[PDB]
Design a protein that fits this description.
Elements lengths: L2 H8 L6 H21 L4 H6 L2 H14 L1 H5 L2 H8 L3 H8 L3 H5 L1 H13 L8
Bound molecules: nickel (II) ion (3 copies).
One nickel (II) ion binds next to loops.
């Protein structure tokens, strides 16, 4: 499991072949670039382990860099590895209430630092 496999599960997968996967990879790259150029997201990203880095990329892939950067309080919790504190707030969001199954997987990934939520 990795960010690409993770996002394929959360997003559709399937449609379009190697040309479609170029667009997918480009969107993953754009998400990472969005993180690394944002003053609020980069220090969080830098502090995170490889598994939780994927979780953050996932959020930015879905909502965009400006959207994710709006989670100021949760991002602070993530930066100091207070996973449960972050989880409480992230679960109370437009994001969660619009895509609850995906958001729960992403949040659980933040909580555990494992890929267990994607083993199903
Ligand atoms: Ni602080
Ligand atoms: Ni602490
Ligand atoms: Ni709080």
């Amino acid at each position: 499991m990795n960010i690409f496999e993770m996002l394929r599960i959360d997003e559709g997968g399937g449609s379009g072949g190697d040309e479609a996967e170029k667009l997918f990879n480009q969107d993953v790259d754009a998400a990472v670039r969005g993180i690394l150029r944002n003053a609020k997201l980069k220090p969080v990203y830098d502090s995170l382990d490889a598994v939780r880095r994927a979780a953050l990329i996932n959020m930015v892939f879905q909502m965009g860099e400006t959207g994710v950067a709006g989670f100021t309080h949760s991002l602070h919790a993530l930066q100091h590895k207070h996973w449960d504190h972050a989880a409480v707030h992230l679960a109370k969001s437009r994001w969660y209430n619009q895509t609850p199954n995906r958001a729960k997987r992403v949040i659980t990934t933040f909580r555990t630092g494992t890929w267990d939520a994607y083993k199903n």
